[PDB]
Design a protein around this ligand. Structure first.
Ligand SMILES: [Mg+2]
Ligand SMILES: [Mg+2]
Ligand SMILES: [Mg+2]
Ligand SMILES: [Mg+2]
Ligand SMILES: [Mg+2]
Ligand SMILES: [Mg+2]
Ligand SMILES: [Mg+2]
Ligand SMILES: [Mg+2]
Ligand SMILES: [Mg+2]
Ligand SMILES: [Mg+2]
Ligand SMILES: [Mg+2]
Ligand SMILES: [Mg+2]
Ligand SMILES: [Mg+2]
Ligand SMILES: [Mg+2]
Ligand SMILES: [Mg+2]
Ligand SMILES: [Mg+2]
Ligand SMILES: [Mg+2]
Ligand SMILES: [Mg+2]
Ligand SMILES: [Mg+2]
Ligand SMILES: [Zn+2]
Lengths: 122, 49, 58, 56, 97, 99, 137, 86
RNA sequence: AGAGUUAAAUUAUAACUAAGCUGUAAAAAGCCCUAGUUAAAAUAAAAUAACCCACGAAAGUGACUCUAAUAAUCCUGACACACGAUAGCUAGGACCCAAACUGGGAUUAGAUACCCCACUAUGCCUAGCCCUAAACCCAAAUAGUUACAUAACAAAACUA
């Protein structure tokens, strides 16, 4: 997976939410995207009140869209999602599953530094 | 191995047809990425609630 | 644990630039310091204010 | 200015067998379409070293 | 021709190296629980190494993750989310004495 | 005749390897009020506190059981050329020579 | 006895009442403690001002009103005017780090008023506006 | 401001004793440096002054740490001496 | 280097409530179109992490996201070429807050200072200049050695 779209949607009923998700996904496929998956993180009360589109929002729905897109297009998508009034806040991140975990082999302990000063007898 | 891997993954992707279905499906199944650790280096998961 | 001393000070070998500029050399002295006597503050001020309110009233 | 075509199927995936039999989608994810800029640079490097040189 | 002389082998007794609680885990900005473990409940501050006790790599990772999750709107900045208060305490700080 | 190498290879201290967490037998050659100065036979004596259970059973010449932590307590400190020897060993007094 | 230092989140079922009210329904005593002065205002949970007392309101003057004695006096005065409007309990919010912090708090206690929670909200910029220059160049 | 009120930097008083509660609070704030930062931000400190302060503080910490370490390492030998008047 | 974004403050601005608020070692002057609480754009700046020691040639760089990207099969080398903190200059835009200047208030023998209040150039953005710093880690670059050997102090001594 290449990009990860973190989507925070206005908290709404079933049909309208499905609607927004649909037109958003379409909007993605239109900029040339291939959508791998859609996940739902549920609706929660937001960490802090978010002001967007002349509305101050308390709650919201959370979604992940993993997808492949040409490098060029991210900006484009962003623009779109900015002017959508049903989106509380967009973000697009290089997918966490592209970066792979190197091995902590342990903690190499650091010896106390030596020869910082001369052998002078005070 | 990589080409065949993606060959398999590709079967699952969302397309113009799968749109309504996969959307209505994902609306039904909340997932959590949440987990905690213990001082021992052990993973603790919430789903046991 | 002690904050690392590696690559911190300016030395002829060291590749990078100084982090710590020690005022006096870091060497453990053979004595410690003398405890700093506590700064005194006014005592009984609460009971005083109570008494002064009592007086102003009566 | 040269043009390393959007479908050109990036350098590491060109010599793996039976690639062209794969469906359009996977072929597209391995295209210079979904690629980085550094991929186009790998390709350009290869093409140039082949055009110009004797022993690539 | 003495066979009782020592052999130039590496140390057999040498212990394994100790590990950050997270050595070969994956820190993800998306999970607010693991992150808010390393935050001060009352303030929302991020604890340092001397507190969390991590390899530099993982202290970095936790930090970057926390910041990202904070601005993307996953996790609150000024306090630990109450929901996560009673989770396991891995940090070495004692406020109440 | 025995080569020094031969002796060293087979000696009980060589057999022990790393001195951490080792069960050792040691003898009390000196006493101060609560302090038992114990020669366990390696190099330095260790010093243990007299336990509350059977306190008077510990006397000069008594034998005891120890858990050895460190053969010699030593560390290097800020701005020093060599380490700092406490001229002791580090041990835990378990009980006395169950027999 | 299980006692949590942490307060009662609103969405929780948690039952604790002071004179029957929820933690949220309790009035709030705002104490602004600044180096030259201390202001106290008791307010409804609905943010309707009940009572106002300050070290200036209390008839001190310039330097004098900085001190902790003055803060205590203002705290007592505030608690009086507030209990006059019948507030039994209060949640303290302390804004600022100054001479009159603790004095004004226990001056609220001394003034016949009950403190349940004590919060510190002190402005802490994560680097906003540059503050004025240091004294003694 | 946009966060929920009363969840942070808040202590509940126990059994009506306010002084101990405030003490707990102040210990919290001091623990997290919040007090030192409140105090330091009253006047602007120019970046080089800051840099200097940080370097000095770290040196100080290194020395204190190391001294406390030699203290606790040497603490055993404070016992009454065996060989007195040898 | 681009483009997009904003958590904590702060402020225009209302709504209640209070007559004071601000300011010092202490006051005065200032402000009461003020103050506390509840609402809030723009602007600017980037707590904690950082007890870390990374990136860049240096200057520099530590809120978030993405795009682009960190010369040389790696000796030295200019007056040639390209950069270069802060301040400063030109033109347009921004202005929360800070603040040379200046005007008030104290202080003082004086006070064209230190302390207090107010406000400006300026700090910010775009484009172009200017080319200096205790631009100092006062330690040239590249390879090495720990041999001989302490002017003093400091960051030990040396070879090519
Ligand atoms: Mg460098
Ligand atoms: Mg000096
Ligand atoms: Mg000067
Ligand atoms: Mg620009
Ligand atoms: Mg804000
Ligand atoms: Mg404006
Ligand atoms: Mg006046
Ligand atoms: Mg910040
Ligand atoms: Mg290079
Ligand atoms: Mg050269
Ligand atoms: Mg310049
Ligand atoms: Mg201009
Ligand atoms: Mg201006
Ligand atoms: Mg000013
Ligand atoms: Mg004047
Ligand atoms: Mg300029
Ligand atoms: Mg410099
Ligand atoms: Mg020079
Ligand atoms: Mg040179
Ligand atoms: Zn690790």
């Amino acid at each position: 997976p290449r990009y990860e779209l973190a989507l925070i949607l206005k908290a709404m009923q079933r049909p309208e939410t499905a609607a927004a998700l649909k037109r958003t996904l379409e909007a993605l496929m239109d900029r040339g995207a291939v959508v791998r998956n859609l996940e739902n993180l549920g609706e929660r009360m937001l960490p802090y009140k978010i002001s967007a589109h002349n509305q101050r929002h308390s709650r919201g729905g959370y979604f992940l869209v993993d997808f492949y897109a040409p490098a060029t297009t991210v900006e484009s998508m962003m623009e779109h999602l900015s002017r959508d009034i049903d989106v509380i806040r967009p973000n697009i991140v290089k997918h966490p599953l592209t970066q792979e975990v190197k091995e902590c082999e342990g903690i190499v302990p650091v010896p106390l530094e030596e020869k910082l000063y001369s052998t002078k007898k005070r | 191995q990589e080409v065949l891997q993606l060959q398999e993954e590709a079967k699952t992707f969302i397309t113009r047809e799968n749109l309504e279905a996969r959307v209505e499906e994902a609306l039904d199944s909340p997932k959590s990425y949440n987990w905690a650790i213990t001082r021992e280096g052990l993973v603790v998961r919430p789903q046991q609630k | 644990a002690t904050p690392s001393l590696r690559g911190r000070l300016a030395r002829l070998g060291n590749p990078r630039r100084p982090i710590l500029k020690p005022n006096k050399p870091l060497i453990l002295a053979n004595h410690v310091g003398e405890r700093r006597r506590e700064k005194g503050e006014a005592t009984c001020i609460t009971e005083m204010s109570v008494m002064m309110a009592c007086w102003k009233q009566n | 200015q040269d043009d390393p075509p959007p479908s050109m199927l990036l350098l590491d995936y060109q010599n793996v067998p039976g690639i062209h039999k794969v469906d359009d989608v996977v072929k597209r994810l391995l295209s210079l379409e979904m690629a980085n800029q550094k991929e186009k640079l790998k390709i350009k490097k290869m093409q140039l070293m082949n055009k110009v040189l004797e022993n690539p | 021709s003495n066979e009782d002389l020592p052999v130039p082998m590496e140390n057999p007794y040498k212990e394994p190296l100790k590990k950050c609680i997270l050595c070969e885990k994956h820190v993800d900005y998306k999970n607010v629980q693991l992150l808010s473990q390393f935050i001060s409940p009352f303030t929302g501050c991020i604890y340092g190494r001397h507190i969390t006790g991590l390899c530099g790599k993982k202290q970095k990772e936790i930090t970057k993750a926390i910041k990202r999750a904070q601005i993307l709107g996953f996790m609150p900045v000024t306090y630990k989310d109450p929901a996560y208060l009673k989770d396991p305490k891995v940090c070495n700080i004692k406020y109440r004495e | 005749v025995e080569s020094f190498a031969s002796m060293l290879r087979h000696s009980p201290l060589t057999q022990m390897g790393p001195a951490k967490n080792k069960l050792v037998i040691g003898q009390i050659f000196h006493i101060v009020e609560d302090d038992l100065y114990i020669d366990f036979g390696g190099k330095f004596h260790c010093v243990c506190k007299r336990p509350e259970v059977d306190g008077e059973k510990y006397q000069k010449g008594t034998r005891v059981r120890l858990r050895l932590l460190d053969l010699e307590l030593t560390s290097r400190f800020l701005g020093a050329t060599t380490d700092t020897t406490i001229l002791e060993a580090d041990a835990v007094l378990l009980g006395l020579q169950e027999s | 006895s299980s006692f949590s230092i942490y307060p009662p989140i609103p969405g929780q079922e948690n039952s604790l009442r002071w004179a029957g009210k929820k933690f949220e329904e309790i009035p709030i005593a705002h104490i602004k403690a600044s180096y030259n002065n201390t202001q106290i205002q008791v307010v409804s949970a609905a943010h309707q001002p009940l009572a106002h007392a300050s070290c200036g309101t209390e008839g001190f003057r310039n330097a004098k009103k900085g001190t902790g004695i003055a803060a205590q006096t203002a705290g007592i005065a505030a608690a009086a005017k507030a209990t006059g409007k019948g507030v039994t309990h209060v949640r303290v919010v302390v804004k600022g780090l100054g001479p009159g912090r603790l004095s004004a708090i226990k001056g609220l206690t001394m003034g016949g008023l009950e403190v349940i929670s004590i919060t510190d909200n002190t402005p802490i910029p994560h680097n906003g506006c540059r503050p004025r220059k240091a004294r003694r160049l | 401001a946009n966060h929920l009120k009363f969840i942070a930097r808040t202590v509940m008083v126990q059994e009506g004793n306010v002084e101990g509660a405030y003490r707990t609070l102040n210990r919290i704030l001091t623990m997290d440096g919040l007090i030192e930062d409140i105090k330091r931000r009253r006047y602007y400190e120019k970046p080089c002054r800051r840099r200097q302060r940080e370097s000095y503080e770290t040196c100080r910490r290194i020395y204190n740490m190391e001294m406390a370490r030699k203290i606790n390492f040497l603490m055993r030998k404070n016992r009454a001496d065996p060989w007195q008047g040898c």
